[PDB]
């Protein structure tokens, strides 16, 4: 037939080694642009003034960093939320000095990361699958949207976003605690229970299945050869695993149903990380964690400190030190 | 930067020694039947 029809058949072809798709038409160029710029920036980018006070910060390997300390530095605080592509700077040298590459990377990334989520629905539709794997991937994606855009929006500058580095991320966690007390916010607490229980339930489900394999191999070879790809048989006894775990706790604290169980394994961490993503997105608008400073007080009026008042002391130490020259006034309201 | 001098040979052997261990075991497996 025509070439456009033949092109549409190739984009949606289920026989490609890597599925393209209509979401993939946008995802591939945006990702390729983001990694190529990230690799080059991480190696040889000149220093960047992130805080806009003519105080550049070295972030690339060729400028005295290692893998632990290297980072792509956020754009200057003099730009704020302004769009800053390459063609808005009088040259590349000006573009690199004001943290230009940071905007180009996170924009092309979040675009491709979103199309990556839709690409999961697209291939599910062409293979006869149910579509809700993309919904589970929305939890880590919304998390990336929070620390890269939602928080710079609420604070009014991309210089306050999470840097693209290992030590840069550590700088983002410490300052976020001093200005929002994220540890005392319930949504981060729900996020910890999602990742702690996520690893707990991962180790548990992995152990109980590897506790009741049908014996189909000798002692000389691996147990994995007892399963063969595409076989109709289930290679482990489910009611045998239910009989063990149901006696450790009690019978009704164990899942007898395999579909109800894997749903619980998918549900728990996804909605848990959904909250810790919503925790970052809400504290972006300065609705911070619980404040119990000087909340207990004696019959006279002396402040009886608690463990919350000690947390306030460590927070004061971070707050008075972060961005040691960026402030001229007694309050840090952004 | 003034880094450690033995760090180069530390990383080089840290990569090489366990690498060739897995490579020897793999090539001798495909040469079987």
């Amino acid at each position: 037939a025509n070439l456009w029809e033949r092109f549409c058949n190739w984009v949606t072809s289920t026989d490609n080694r890597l599925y393209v798709g209509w979401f993939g038409v946008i995802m591939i160029p945006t990702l390729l642009a983001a990694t190529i710029c990230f690799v080059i920036a991480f190696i040889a980018a000149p220093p960047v003034d992130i805080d806009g006070i003519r105080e550049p910060v070295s972030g690339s390997l060729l400028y005295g960093n290692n893998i632990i300390t290297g980072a792509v530095v956020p754009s200057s605080n003099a730009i704020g939320l302004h769009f800053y592509p390459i063609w808005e700077a009088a040259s590349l040298d000006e573009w690199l000095y004001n943290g230009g590459p940071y905007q180009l990377i996170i924009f092309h990334f979040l675009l491709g990361a979103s199309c990556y989520m839709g690409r999961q629905w697209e291939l599910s539709y062409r293979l006869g699958m149910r579509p809700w794997i993309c919904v589970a991937y929305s939890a880590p994606l919304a998390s990336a949207f929070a620390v890269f855009l939602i928080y710079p929006i609420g604070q009014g500058s991309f210089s306050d976003g999470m840097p693209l580095g290992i030590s840069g991320t550590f700088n983002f966690m410490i300052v976020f605690q001093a200005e929002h007390n994220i540890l005392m916010h319930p949504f981060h607490q729900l996020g910890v229970a999602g990742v702690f229980g996520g690893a707990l339930f991962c180790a548990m489900h992995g152990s109980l299945v590897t506790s009741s394999l049908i014996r189909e191999t000798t002692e000389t070879e691996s147990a994995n050869y007892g399963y063969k790809f595409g076989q109709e048989e289930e290679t482990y006894n489910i009611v045998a695993a239910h009989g063990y775990f149901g006696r450790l706790i009690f019978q009704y604290a164990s899942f007898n149903n395999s579909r109800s169980l894997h749903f619980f394994l998918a549900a728990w961490p996804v909605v848990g990380v959904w909250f810790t993503a919503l925790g970052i997105s809400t504290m972006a608008f300065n609705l911070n964690g619980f404040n119990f400073n000087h909340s207990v007080i004696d019959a006279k009026g002396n402040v009886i400190n608690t463990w919350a008042d000690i947390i306030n002391r460590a927070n004061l130490g971070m707050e008075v030190m972060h961005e040691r020259n960026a402030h001229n006034f007694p309050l840090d309201l952004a | 930067m003034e880094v450690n001098q033995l760090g180069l040979i530390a990383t080089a052997l840290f990569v090489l020694v366990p690498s060739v261990f897995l490579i020897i075991l793999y090539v001798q497996t495909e040469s079987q039947q």
């Binding site: 390997l61 893998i67 790809f229 | 990569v15």
Partner: peptide, 30 residues
């Protein structure tokens, strides 16, 4: 020597991706 050592390891991990995908062991059904 450090910068060359970091990028060399990074290049091997990327080269490892190309073989683990396009030169994997085909999974076959039976």
């Amino acid at each position: 020597m450090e910068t060359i050592t970091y990028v060399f390891i990074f290049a091997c991990i990327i080269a490892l991706f190309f073989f683990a995908i396009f030169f994997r062991e085909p999974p076959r059904i039976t």
